[PDB]
Design an enzyme around this catalytic site. Structure first.
Site, PDB file in Angstrom:
ATOM      1  N   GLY A  22       0.768  -1.046   0.045  1.00  0.00           N
ATOM      2  CA  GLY A  22       0.083   0.031   0.030  1.00  0.00           C
ATOM      3  C   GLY A  22       1.051   1.259   0.040  1.00  0.00           C
ATOM      4  O   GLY A  22       1.814   1.341   0.663  1.00  0.00           O
ATOM      5  N   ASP A 142     -11.186   6.776   9.381  1.00  0.00           N
ATOM      6  CA  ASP A 142     -10.855   6.423   7.923  1.00  0.00           C
ATOM      7  C   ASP A 142     -11.344   5.026   7.778  1.00  0.00           C
ATOM      8  O   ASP A 142     -10.639   4.066   7.197  1.00  0.00           O
ATOM      9  CB  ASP A 142      -9.265   6.432   7.768  1.00  0.00           C
ATOM     10  CG  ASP A 142      -8.798   6.448   6.618  1.00  0.00           C
ATOM     11  OD1 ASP A 142      -9.338   6.880   5.352  1.00  0.00           O
ATOM     12  OD2 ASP A 142      -7.597   6.103   6.456  1.00  0.00           O
TER      13      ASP A 142
HETATM   14  C1  0NV Z   1      -0.191   4.086   3.109  1.00  0.00           C
HETATM   15  C2  0NV Z   1      -0.527   3.545   4.567  1.00  0.00           C
HETATM   16  C3  0NV Z   1      -1.757   2.703   4.454  1.00  0.00           C
HETATM   17  C4  0NV Z   1      -2.606   2.548   3.480  1.00  0.00           C
HETATM   18  C5  0NV Z   1      -3.638   1.425   3.769  1.00  0.00           C
HETATM   19  N1  0NV Z   1      -3.206   0.007   3.282  1.00  0.00           N
HETATM   20  C6  0NV Z   1      -2.112  -0.307   3.656  1.00  0.00           C
HETATM   21  C7  0NV Z   1      -1.643  -1.841   3.133  1.00  0.00           C
HETATM   22  C8  0NV Z   1      -2.792  -2.690   3.776  1.00  0.00           C
HETATM   23  N2  0NV Z   1      -2.719  -4.132   3.183  1.00  0.00           N
HETATM   24  C9  0NV Z   1      -3.027  -4.697   2.057  1.00  0.00           C
HETATM   25  N3  0NV Z   1      -2.519  -5.922   2.167  1.00  0.00           N
HETATM   26  C10 0NV Z   1      -2.265  -6.273   3.290  1.00  0.00           C
HETATM   27  C11 0NV Z   1      -1.804  -7.424   3.669  1.00  0.00           C
HETATM   28  N4  0NV Z   1      -1.237  -7.579   5.028  1.00  0.00           N
HETATM   29  C12 0NV Z   1      -1.301  -6.604   5.826  1.00  0.00           C
HETATM   30  N5  0NV Z   1      -0.747  -6.434   7.094  1.00  0.00           N
HETATM   31  C13 0NV Z   1      -0.853  -5.141   7.402  1.00  0.00           C
HETATM   32  C14 0NV Z   1      -1.127  -4.080   6.395  1.00  0.00           C
HETATM   33  C15 0NV Z   1      -1.639  -4.986   5.546  1.00  0.00           C
HETATM   34  C16 0NV Z   1      -2.112  -5.140   4.078  1.00  0.00           C
HETATM   35  C17 0NV Z   1      -4.157  -2.281   2.933  1.00  0.00           C
HETATM   36  C18 0NV Z   1      -4.533  -0.593   3.656  1.00  0.00           C
HETATM   37  C19 0NV Z   1      -2.195   2.795   2.424  1.00  0.00           C
HETATM   38  C20 0NV Z   1      -1.219   3.854   2.056  1.00  0.00           C
END
Ligand code: 0NV
Length: 298
Positions: A22, A142
């Site tokens: 992300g 959010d």
């Molecule tokens: C900057 C900061 C935050 C965001 C939100 N964004 C961050 C990555 C998040 N994410 C996507 N696939 C994931 C798999 N495992 C994970 N463990 C923790 C997070 C995570 C995953 C989804 C929300 C986007 C951009």
């Protein structure tokens, strides 16, 4: 010699980038492999870091790490630790890695396999995750399906806290004046107009998450796609916000998705009450959604 009295401190040298999960504005989340044995025996983790950090942004990040550390619930992403990278001159947050990704990409990819009772299960769990935050006086600020993670077919977790505020014991809402673009189509009217945030404003955004689930993340049905349709597709810039606020304050709302049950649409509209004080609590929503499931269980 080596003594480890703190497994929450990850060593940057044993931590290896794999692919981006992300990417935002002043932040980014990566999938990493951590190998204290370097034969590959260590956990896959998720690592958040700052980009274009201010000294101000770092103070927030330290506060967001504290928040996430304070949280233990089956529906809140697990904190694992910190890495003080760049030889201890940088800070990163280490979290469990959930293989199915965000609810948004999961529901778009498997939208055939996922029936109504299922969408109801994830809705209930998001509610419980949020009632847990409210027990802490935390305001998420959010909620949208991209910030919800899928650990597997039967569990989701709330998985970002970068905007989360902690209410003092004295107060019931948090006014926060901030620069830059906001997700205006998920925002409560008082959040659009007075930058005011509370548990009730999260209740509003929850109603929109529920809408997103019941549209199966279909792009043409999305909140901005349907709002722009009502405001007028040709509107640009400040004009949109003007029209979005006026449309909301006179009771204009997102339409009922194709095939969405009225009782579930009705929960969305209760969440979207202009009167902050007539918004249900998350305890009320988890209770309503669980009784609905149980009446669809038998
Ligand atoms: C900057 C900061 C935050 C965001 C939100 N964004 C961050 C990555 C998040 N994410 C996507 N696939 C994931 C798999 N495992 C994970 N463990 C923790 C997070 C995570 C995953 C989804 C929300 C986007 C951009």
């Amino acid at each position: 010699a080596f003594e480890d009295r703190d497994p929450t401190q990850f060593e940057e040298r044993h931590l290896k980038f794999l692919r981006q999960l992300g990417k935002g504005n002043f932040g980014s989340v990566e999938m990493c492999r951590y190998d204290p044995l370097q034969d590959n025996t260590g956990e896959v983790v998720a690592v958040k870091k700052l980009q274009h950090s201010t000294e101000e942004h770092l103070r927030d990040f330290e506060r967001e790490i504290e928040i996430l550390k304070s949280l233990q619930h089956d529906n809140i992403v697990k904190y694992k630790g910190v890495c003080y990278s760049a030889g201890r001159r940088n800070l990163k947050l280490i979290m469990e890695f959930l293989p199915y990704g965000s609810l948004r990409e999961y529901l778009q990819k498997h939208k055939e396999r996922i029936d109504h009772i299922k969408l109801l299960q994830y809705t209930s769990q998001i509610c419980k995750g949020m009632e847990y935050l409210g027990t802490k006086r935390y305001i998420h600020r959010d909620l949208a399906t991209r910030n919800i993670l899928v650990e597997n077919e039967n569990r989701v977790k709330i998985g970002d806290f970068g905007l989360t505020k902690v209410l003092p014991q004295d107060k019931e809402y948090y006014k926060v004046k901030e620069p830059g673009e906001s997700p205006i189509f998920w925002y409560a009217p008082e959040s659009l107009t007075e930058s005011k945030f509370s548990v009730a404003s999260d209740v509003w955004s929850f109603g929109v998450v529920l809408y997103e689930l019941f549209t199966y993340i279909e792009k043409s049905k999305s909140p901005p796609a349907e709002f722009m349709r009502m405001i007028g597709n040709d509107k640009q810039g400040q004009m949109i916000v003007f029209h979005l606020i006026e449309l909301l304050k006179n009771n204009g709302r997102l339409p009922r998705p194709d095939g969405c049950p009225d009782e579930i649409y009705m929960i969305m509209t209760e969440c979207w009450n202009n009167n902050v004080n007539q918004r249900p609590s998350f305890r009320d929503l988890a209770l309503r959604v669980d009784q609905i499931r149980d009446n669809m269980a038998g």
